[PDB]
Design a protein around this ligand. Structure first.
Ligand SMILES: CC(=O)Nc1ccc(C(=O)Nn2cnnc2)cc1
Length: 119
């Protein structure tokens, strides 16, 4: 990550861009497993093996409350969603596949956001 991503405070204009990035991910066809916290009835052992869970609704709450001070902090929460998924689930599961697709999409949108900040 470059110096702007790590050290430049998030402005109100930056926050309008983060809201747009988040809504794009929430609208994606393969986002369904990540929209809300993992249901422990669907995965009884999940909260014993994943110590820092994360999901898109928790991120939306944090964006609305202006939790994030730097872009790096927002990227870290998003990356946690995909890393948790690839660690918990086997490489041939549909959950793992959704993580691969949605992370590629996040990177495309994130590059777009970074470009709009600087120029
Ligand atoms: C985002 C995420 O990781 N969610 C998630 C992953 C795996 C299951 C799961 O194990 N479902 N299941 C029940 N019986 N066989 C398979 C449920 C939810």
């Amino acid at each position: 990550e470059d110096a702007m991503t790590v050290l430049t405070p998030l402005t109100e204009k930056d926050y309008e861009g983060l809201k747009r990035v988040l809504r794009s991910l929430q609208a994606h066809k393969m986002a369904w497993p990540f929209l809300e916290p993992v249901d422990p009835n669907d995965a009884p052992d999940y909260y014993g093996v994943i110590k820092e869970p994360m999901d898109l609704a928790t991120m939306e709450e944090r964006v609305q409350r202006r939790y994030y001070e730097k872009l790096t902090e927002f990227v870290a929460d998003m990356t946690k969603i995909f890393d948790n998924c690839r660690y918990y689930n086997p490489s041939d599961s549909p959950f793992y596949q959704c993580a691969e697709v949605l992370e590629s999409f996040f990177v495309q949108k994130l590059k777009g956001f970074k470009a709009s900040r600087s120029h």
